[PDB]
């Protein structure tokens, strides 16, 4: 009974985290009901249905194809469709060849052919291109060829078997795609934009909180987590962006995403973000570290460091907005220009020999922190140029 | 014809990179031949085979289940088996209920039941636990329940259909597992140990080459790549280690890996490595950067930095050996003790005010580099303690 409480609480938090999960749970059931009802009531034409398993293969197609996003289901559906078509052609051809062979040398030749093409296809599944894009395609290639060949079906129930398999795959896939596109879409493109916006948000949060924390029982652990996990979720989000990009390259042009949309460049912006997160990780590890300088030595450099940190944080916040709501903004320009001014003023302040009363070890720590903030400022300028150009050249809402 | 050259060259390099890929390509074909031949020649008992599709489902099971590793195929096979068993029980029960309902209210109740359980299962597929371990299990749960229910099969061909599906899944899965275990195994545990060893190797390479490069037309780009990509492959290897760990938790106890083996701790060691790679990334970005100090200011600190870098590099090399060949070694202890001695001597050298003739900006760059090397030394000590304990407490070849 205790596990009932635990599991229903995990269910509650999963549902509250993203309600589109609940609507997708209903969409799967709607697809199953739709296909099954299509095959029960023969709507306009009762197919030949010589085998009696059409409903089986259609329900299995719908269950395996229907994924969360729209690009995911469209990719799986298109892979399954094309692979079934090609493997059906080769299955009919190979079976005609083996029937031309003889009557007893027929299973030997069929088994040899299945062995050859399954070996070649399993080896091709290791290539980088085919793996990143069309791995399910090669899987269904092997599946359908081995279906049409290695199944103990007669020589005249093959032209009908492949045709029925293709028809059923087409119907299940089309049902899946139409429901997933027209009911309550979950586009992978929007999810990528929103993931990048969330990452920008967490980095800006850390930068402001750091600017205020560098110069200062269970609440301590609360603050420590608020510093750690917030950025630590950016470092572990490369596979997620690389997945959403792949899923996004399949979708059709919906509202504000034209035909040719540069997803590779958005993954590049994500990589630049992750570089900023490397540097921020080093900064945090310098916050938590044991060896702590007295406060006044940091207070003598407080002003430029605080200005640099806060300005880069605000610039990342504005990039977050301009990536989420897809509205072309240009305030990051001002927020990065003032950052450059702060870095220059810090250089001129260091030229004054103010650091001639400090132990060399404290000099190591202090100079490391200054160098970190300078690096994050420059990287923020790079990301701002990248996003500004990527939006200007992609026709966002330039109206401001 | 040009694409023929290109594709056969990619095939050659993929084969030469890892020949176990070729042997696995042959293993898939051997599994298909084995199962098909088992179903053609009825070996000891010709099953009832009331539907005529047993060979289809067995070949499809083998094609979908058989993966590269041994843990991968064992996981997919066990998930498919258990999910088919449970969903078969529920399918028979639900169908008995719906037959008890009536004769015309039967399809309505069956469709409602399929909708309910497909919705609940699709929602459960989003949990973190079920997603990381048993997602294919829930997929086959939905598949088999919808097979037994939504297929237009009569009321008495259901007790036989589920039984035949379970039998066929069992035979295909057992064939896959036995071939994958007894022919030429590809253990995911060994692949994880070897991946960690490769990562350690690349980091040691960078540390030595950096120790020699910090103090110095197309060969320049060669050296630049040799610095960049070597460590840049460590940053992008979190999903791979996290995959091989999951695959490794399924395998049975083979030669030197006992029953309870701590894979979570090895993924933790991988994470520590990736922290060292963050710091190394900052170091490399300081190498390539435009603002370059004259050489003599670095030469005045050459000795301790060179000693620290080379000692930590050798220590990482010995950890690589002790992780690859699974032999318990303790030379990293000496190689980290001398590192601590170098760091202490560097502190005493800095206490001498030797840095009183240098511009503060050059001070920023120099002190940042010194702080980086100190951080990597300490992190190497942490990883060495972790691996030394993880090996001592797991009974490696302590004989040295």
From Swiss-Prot, chains A, B:
Miscellaneous notes: Essential factor for aluminum (Al) tolerance but does not represent the major Al tolerance QTL also found on chromosome 1. Acts in parallel but independently of MATE, an aluminum-activated root citrate transporter. A reversible phosphorylation acting both at the transcriptional and post-transcriptional levels is required to activate malate release in response to aluminum.
A single Gene Ontology CC term: plasma membrane
Chief place of localization: membrane
Protein name: Aluminum-activated malate transporter 1
Molecular function terms, GO-annotated: malate transmembrane transporter activity
Regulation: Activated by external aluminum.
Source species, domain of life: Eukaryota
Residues the record lists as Phosphoserine modifications: 315, 322
Disruption outcome: No visible phenotype when grown under normal conditions. Lack of aluminum-activated malate release and shorter roots when submitted to aluminum stress.
């Amino acid at each position: 009974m205790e596990k009932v409480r635990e599991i229903v609480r995990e269910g509650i938090r999963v549902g509250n985290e993203d309600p589109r999960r609940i609507i997708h749970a209903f969409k799967v059931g709607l697809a199953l009901v739709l296909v099954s009802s299509f095959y029960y009531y023969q709507p306009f034409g009762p197919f030949t249905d010589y085998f009696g398993i059409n409903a089986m293969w259609a329900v299995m197609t719908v269950v395996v194809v229907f994924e969360f996003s729209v690009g995911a289901t469209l990719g799986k559906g298109l892979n399954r469709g094309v692979a079934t078509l090609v493997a059906g052609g080769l299955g009919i051809g190979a079976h005609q060849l083996a029937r031309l062979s003889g009557a007893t040398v027929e299973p030997i030749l069929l088994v040899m052919l299945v062995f050859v093409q399954a070996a070649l296809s399993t080896f091709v599944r290791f290539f980088p291109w085919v793996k990143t894009k069309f791995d399910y395609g090669i899987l269904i290639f092997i599946l359908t060829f081995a279906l049409i060949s290695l199944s103990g079906f007669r020589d005249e129930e093959i032209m009908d078997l492949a045709e029925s398999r293709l028809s059923t795959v087409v119907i299940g896939g089309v049902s899946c795609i139409l429901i997933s596109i027209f009911v309550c879409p979950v586009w992978a493109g929007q999810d990528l934009h929103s993931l990048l916006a969330s990452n920008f948000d967490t980095l800006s949060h850390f930068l402001q909180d750091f600017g205020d924390e560098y110069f200062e029982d269970y609440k301590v652990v609360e603050k420590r987590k608020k510093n750690l996990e917030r950025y630590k979720s950016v470092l572990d989000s490369k596979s997620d962006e690389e997945a959403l990009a792949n899923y996004a390259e399949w979708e059709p042009p919906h509202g504000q995403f034209r035909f040719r949309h540069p997803w590779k460049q958005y993954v590049a912006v994500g990589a630049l973000l992750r570089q900023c997160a490397y540097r921020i990780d080093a900064l945090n590890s310098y916050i938590n570290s044991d060896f702590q300088i007295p406060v006044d030595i940091k207070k003598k450099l407080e002003t430029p460091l605080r200005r640099m940190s806060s300005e880069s944080g605000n610039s990342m916040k504005e990039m977050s907005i301009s990536l989420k709501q897809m509205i072309k903004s240009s305030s990051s320009d001002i927020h990065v220009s003032n950052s450059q001014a702060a870095c220059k003023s810090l250089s001129t302040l260091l030229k004054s020999g103010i650091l001639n009363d400090v132990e060399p070890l404290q000099m190591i720590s202090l100079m490391t922190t200054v160098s970190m903030l300078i690096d994050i400022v420059n990287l923020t300028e790079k990301i701002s140029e990248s996003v500004h150009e990527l939006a200007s050249a992609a026709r966002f809402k330039n109206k401001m």
